[PDB]
């Protein structure tokens, strides 16, 4: 039943050297891709928050300075968490960066995206509910061996599953950071907050929602004028990506509601044709597990997604894969009986991709027969790839952990809802 990887697993090895940086991870640090947040932990002493970096093209070494933080959770004391934003990066350029400049230096690299534009191709990985089981490791292996070559991971929430351990044993956040480093140190992952990040534990006097996650994983939320790390937007290549918080407030007048309504107004499909929404809890879901948990946010935001021609909504939370038809359920007025989802070519596709591994359990129970709103579903571990070719075409594919790394078990062409709104069913 415990399918979590043991503490002495190779993927959790501590990088050697006195105060060697560990749990190194990067994410986009600005609105348009010219910056990068570099994050890592030192365990032996605070160390330096400086990052040394240079482009392959110019080879000029520069230093950026950041900030160190620590937290406590019950009887756990963290190591020294560093976050440093490197700025004014050149587009479409390979950079190297080094952390741990005082004692044990470690070097990594990333490639900045091209400048935002109509036809800029870009390959997004889709990972959800990863955890640290053996299944999780297989999914990560399949992602990094994919011939499609993902360039940025859109991560739809539920990271370490540390909160399943006694007192949320936050050592299991540290192991998760060491395990995922082999990917996220070299390409950004775009973070969404899920229910396993809430860690609301009044019984051990831990009452601040999202505390361990928010200390460890920073996002560039001020760059889209959000007032909270849990909802924010970034642009990358031909995509505008909106990250939402299933477990924050979204009533009319609340910060998240206000921010999203204004952010949708700011989207420019003439600059980023692909409009992508990330959230943890799926609004369309025909699995037994968490059935209808997404109704609340759906009543608030579904009609806006249709009005603004969102291309696709990605969610996790359900430990399985599902791809909806383009559907809407926005005509209900309490007493008019109109509560059945209908085919709606102006609506986004809703994809559930929470099947990366969690702690080793798949959600296999489905409502039968498959409802008309659901196009394809399967209870298998795996990951997705959203591969943009240009302003009109993107190719989505789903890869199963039991298939070869080059095998797509589901795949479908997306026709852009703004630039090429022809029926893609």
Ligand X SMILES: *[C@@H]1O[C@H](CO)[C@@H](O[C@@H]2O[C@H](CO)[C@@H](O[C@@H]3O[C@H](CO[C@H]4O[C@H](CO)[C@@H](O)[C@H](O)[C@@H]4O)[C@@H](O)[C@H](O)[C@@H]3O[C@H]3O[C@H](CO)[C@@H](O)[C@H](O)[C@@H]3O)[C@H](O)[C@H]2NC(C)=O)[C@H](O[C@@H]2O[C@@H](C)[C@@H](O)[C@@H](O)[C@@H]2O)[C@H]1NC(C)=O
Ligand Y SMILES: *[C@@H]1O[C@H](CO)[C@@H](O[C@@H]2O[C@H](CO)[C@@H](O)[C@H](O)[C@H]2NC(C)=O)[C@H](O)[C@H]1NC(C)=O
Ligand Z SMILES: *[C@@H]1O[C@H](CO)[C@@H](O[C@@H]2O[C@H](CO)[C@@H](O[C@@H]3O[C@H](CO[C@H]4O[C@H](CO)[C@@H](O)[C@H](O)[C@@H]4O)[C@@H](O)[C@H](O[C@H]4O[C@H](CO)[C@@H](O)[C@H](O)[C@@H]4O)[C@@H]3O)[C@H](O)[C@H]2NC(C)=O)[C@H](O[C@@H]2O[C@@H](C)[C@@H](O)[C@@H](O)[C@@H]2O)[C@H]1NC(C)=O
Ligand U SMILES: *[C@@H]1O[C@H](CO)[C@@H](O[C@@H]2O[C@H](CO)[C@@H](O[C@@H]3O[C@H](CO)[C@@H](O)[C@H](O)[C@@H]3O)[C@H](O)[C@H]2NC(C)=O)[C@H](O[C@@H]2O[C@@H](C)[C@@H](O)[C@@H](O)[C@@H]2O)[C@H]1NC(C)=O
Ligand V SMILES: *[C@@H]1O[C@H](CO)[C@@H](O[C@@H]2O[C@H](CO)[C@@H](O[C@@H]3O[C@H](CO)[C@@H](O)[C@H](O)[C@@H]3O)[C@H](O)[C@H]2NC(C)=O)[C@H](O)[C@H]1NC(C)=O
Ligand W SMILES: *[C@@H]1O[C@H](CO)[C@@H](O)[C@H](O)[C@H]1NC(C)=O
Binding-site residues for Zn(2+):
158, 195, 280, 317
Told to judge if 290 belongs to the known catalytic residues of this protein, a careful annotator would answer yes
Q: Does 297 bind a second copy (CB under 8 A)?
A: yes
From the candidates 82, 290, 393, 395, give the one annotated as an active-site residue.
Answer: 290
Q: What is the contact mask toward ligand Y in residues 119 to 148, using x (rule: CB under 6 A)? A: ---------------x--x---x-------
Q: Does 11 bind ligand Y (CB under 6 A)?
A: yes
- Cis amide leading into 272 (omega within 30): no
Question: Using CB under 6 A, which of the segments 160-168, 327-335, 368-376, 388-396 binds ligand Z?
Answer: 388-396
Instruction: Identify which of 177, 209, 176 has the alpha carbon closest to the alpha carbon of residue 195.
Output: 209
Which residues from 389-408 bind ligand Z, rule CB under 6 A?
389-390, 392-393
- Selected from 54, 200, 215, 415, the binder of a second copy by CB under 8 A is 200
CA dist., res. 231 & res. 264, Å (int) = 13
Give the SS3 label for residue 312.
strand
Q: Which residues 6+ apart lie within 8 Å of 178 measured at CB?
A: 11, 12, 13, 14, 22, 23
Contact 160, 173 (CB under 8 A): yes
CA dist., res. 312 & res. 351, Å (int) = 7
Q: What are the C-alpha distances in Å from 121 to residues 62, 127, 154, 388, 390?
A: 30, 20, 16, 5, 6
Of these partners, ligand X, ligand U, ligand W, none, which one is at the site of residue 392 (CB under 5 to 8 Å by kind)? Answer: ligand U
How many residues bind ligand V (CB under 6 A)? The answer is 7
- Selected from 6, 59, 147, 166, the binder of ligand X by CB under 6 A is 166
CB of 43 to ligand X, least distance (A): 14
Q: What is the contact mask toward Fe ion in residues 70 to 109, using x (rule: CB under 5 A)? A: ----------------------------------------
Q: Does 393 bind ligand U (CB under 6 A)?
A: yes
- Selected from 2, 8, 10, 369, the binder of ligand V by CB under 6 A is 10
Query: Please, is 331 exposed, middle or buried when counting C-beta atoms within 10 Å of its C-beta (0-12, 13-18, 19+)?
Result: middle
Q: What are the C-alpha distances in Å from 117 to residues 38, 121, 395, 421, 424?
A: 25, 9, 18, 19, 23
Q: Does 363 bind Fe ion (CB under 5 A)?
A: no
- Selected from 30, 129, 174, 355, the binder of Fe ion by CB under 5 A is 129
Contact 199, 207 (CB under 8 A): no
- Selected from 2, 75, 205, 335, the binder of ligand W by CB under 6 A is 205
Q: How many CB atoms lie within 10 A of CB 327?
A: 24
- Selected from 42, 146, 195, 233, the binder of a second copy by CB under 8 A is 195
Q: Which residues are catalytic?
A: 290
């Amino acid at each position: 039943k415990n399918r979590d990887m043991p503490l002495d697993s190779d993927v959790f090895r501590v990088p050697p050297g006195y105060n060697a940086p560990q749990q190194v991870h990067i994410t986009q640090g600005d609105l348009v891709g010219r910056a990068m947040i570099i994050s890592w932990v030192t365990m032996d002493e605070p160390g330096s928050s400086a990052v040394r970096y240079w482009s392959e093209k110019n080879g000029r070494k520069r230093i950026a300075k950041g900030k160190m933080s620590t937290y406590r959770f019950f009887n756990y004391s963290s190591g020294f968490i560093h976050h440093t934003t490197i700025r004014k990066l050149k587009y479409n350029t390979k950079y190297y960066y080094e952390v741990g400049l005082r004692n044990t230096t470690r070097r990594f690299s990333f490639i900045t995206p091209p400048q935002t534009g109509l036809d800029v191709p870009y390959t997004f990985g889709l990972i959800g509910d990863l955890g640290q089981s053996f299944d999780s490791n297989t999914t990560l292996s399949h992602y990094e061996l994919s011939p499609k070559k993902g360039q940025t991971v859109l991560f739809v929430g539920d990271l370490s599953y540390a909160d399943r351990y006694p007192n949320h044993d936050n050592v299991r956040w540290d192991t998760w950071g060491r395990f995922t480093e082999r990917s996220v140190a070299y390409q950004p992952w775009i973070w969404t907050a899920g229910n396993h990040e809430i860690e609301f534990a009044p019984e051990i006097n831990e009452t601040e929602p999202f505390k361990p996650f928010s200390y460890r994983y920073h996002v560039p939320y001020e760059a889209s004028q959000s007032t909270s790390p849990f909802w924010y937007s970034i642009k990358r290549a031909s995509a505008h990506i909106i990250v939402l918080s299933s477990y924050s407030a979204y009533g009319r007048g609340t910060p998240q509601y206000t921010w999203l309504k204004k952010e949708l107004r700011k989207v420019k499909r003439s600059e980023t044709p692909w409009l992508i929404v990330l959230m943890h809890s799926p609004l369309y879901n025909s699995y037994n597990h968490h059935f209808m948990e997404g109704e609340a946010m759906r009543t608030k935001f579904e009609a806006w997604f249709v009005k603004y021609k969102v291309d696709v909504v990605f969610a996790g939370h359900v430990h399985a894969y599902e791809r909806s038809e383009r559907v809407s359920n926005i005509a209900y007025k309490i007493t008019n009986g109109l509560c059945t989802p209908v085919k709606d070519q102006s609506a986004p596709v809703y994809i559930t991709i929470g099947d990366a591994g969690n702690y080793g359990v798949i959600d296999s129970n489905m409502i039968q027969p498959q409802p008309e709103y659901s196009a394809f579903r399967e209870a298998s571990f795996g990951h997705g790839m959203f591969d943009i070719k240009n302003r009109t075409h993107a190719h989505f594919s789903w890869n199963r952990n039991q298939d070869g790394v080059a095998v797509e078990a589901d795949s479908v062409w997306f026709f852009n809802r703004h630039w090429y709104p022809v029926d893609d069913s």
